Design a protein around this ligand. Structure first.
Ligand SMILES: [Cl-]
Length: 100
């Protein structure tokens, strides 16, 4: 073993997520943060080249979480799914833990 997840940053601002992730070397380095613009919703921020991409974590009626189509009972299961299935529809971008 039990360690906390290296990817949960709570209420950091979108810009602070960009600032942090831009220093990461490896595409797919990522975090989950609690949106300021949409309180009570999560956002996923991900290093890609000289950019950081942001995705809304969406919810169905039952409160399951998804980015596109496949949905999960927890943020943890959605994150893990997207380590081996791209988060993006325009590039192959697979979630990988930040270096720390
Ligand atoms: Cl894929």
């Amino acid at each position: 073993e039990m360690k906390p997840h290296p990817w949960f940053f709570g209420k950091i601002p979108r810009a602070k997520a960009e600032e942090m992730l831009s220093k990461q070397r490896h595409d797919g380095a990522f975090l989950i943060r609690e949106s300021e613009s949409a309180p009570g919703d999560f956002s996923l921020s991900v290093k890609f080249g000289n950019d950081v991409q942001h995705f809304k974590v969406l919810r169905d009626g039952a409160g399951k979480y998804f980015l596109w189509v496949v949905k999960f009972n927890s943020l943890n299961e959605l994150v893990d799914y997207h380590r081996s299935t791209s988060v993006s529809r325009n590039q192959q971008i697979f979630l990988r833990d930040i270096e720390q």
